[PDB]
Design a protein around this ligand. Structure first.
Ligand code: LZP
Length: 282
């Protein structure tokens, strides 16, 4: 299986080497639009842009740009939209996307503040009576309920298209315990968090793709989607041990750069998939 490979790479301590090959082999596509001058203030990181071929487009003239990519996993039949944590000026764009793409869930893998810095704008209302209105995209966001757990928080939000008065319920899954430095010691919490998102139906095909982000929307976001897809695959095909994490990761990297930012993140991904496979299929 992959656990053997995991214990192997660990034994020889070649994770960094394993990770480098991936980066070297990683796909390279143009990000022209993300580079246009008019979109400079719509990007969080200069080294984190969406490829033109898989970028999500806002359904509006003037500027259809948002730093978000559609990651379509054909075999696993699962799609994810990976994006950057909204900026003070792109919160309206962020929810416009959620609306236009018909997403049911938003997965947040970071805290608004980490390492003493703001890694993301406060894009959702923190109190029921203090709704948020996004004038530019003409949308209203209202906090309906909030369930705070030790490792994550789930919120029910009501998104209303002020233009048509139509409303939709959005589930916000906020993983709040990813350490400021490195990765979690054990994947237990992360897996439970993933299973929670799954059980909500937010990842199901009847809905638009789930929207995932952290700070750059690649490191933790990549780990989340990689783990989910690998587990699905091990559940769908004849021999589960045929699932090649590296292959899946390369496949995903064809849609957005940076997925999995460090060799430590890669190891953790293996660890999550391995442990998750034991829970799913004993
Ligand atoms: O965190 C880092 C470390 C890093 O690699 C980096 C990148 C470019 C320049 C740099 O100076 C040199 C330096 C070295 C050591 C100490 C201070 C300063 C450091 C950071 O100094 N920053 C975050 C965002 N940033 C950038 O220049 C980026 O734009 C980096 C990026 O791509 C990125 C941003 C958020 C998350 C992510 O991946 C998930 C993750 C979660 C937890 C731990 C490790 C990784 C990747 C500016 C400040």
């Amino acid at each position: 299986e992959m656990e053997k490979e995991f214990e192997q790479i660990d034994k020889s301590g070649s994770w960094a080497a394993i990770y480098q090959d991936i980066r070297h082999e990683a796909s390279d596509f143009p990000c022209r639009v993300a580079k246009l001058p008019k979109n400079k203030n719509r990007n969080r990181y200069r080294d984190v842009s969406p490829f033109d071929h898989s970028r999500i487009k806002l359904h509006q003239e003037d500027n259809d740009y948002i730093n978000a990519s559609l990651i379509k996993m054909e075999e696993a039949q699962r799609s994810y939209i990976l994006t950057q944590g909204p900026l003070p000026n792109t919160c309206g764009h962020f929810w416009e996307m959620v609306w236009e793409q018909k997403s049911r869930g938003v997965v947040m893998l970071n805290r608004v503040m980490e390492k003493g810095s703001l890694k993301c704008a406060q894009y959702w209302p923190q109190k029921e009576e203090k709704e948020m209105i996004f004038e530019d995209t003409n949308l209203k966001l209202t906090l309906i309920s909030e369930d705070i757990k030790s490792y994550y928080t789930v919120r029910q939000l009501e998104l209303e298209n002020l233009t048509t008065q139509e409303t939709r319920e959005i589930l916000h899954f906020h993983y709040t315990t990813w350490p400021d430095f490195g990765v979690p010691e054990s994947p237990a919490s992360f897996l439970n968090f993933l299973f929670k998102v799954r059980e909500s139906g937010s990842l199901s095909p009847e809905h638009g793709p789930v929207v995932v982000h952290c700070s750059a929307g690649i490191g933790r976001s990549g780990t989340f989607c990689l783990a989910d897809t690998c587990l699905l695959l091990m559940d769908k095909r004849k021999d589960p041990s045929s699932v090649d994490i590296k292959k899946v990761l390369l496949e995903m990297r064809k849609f957005r750069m940076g997925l999995i930012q460090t060799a430590d993140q890669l190891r953790f991904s293996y660890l999550a998939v391995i442990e998750g496979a034991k829970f799913i299929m004993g």
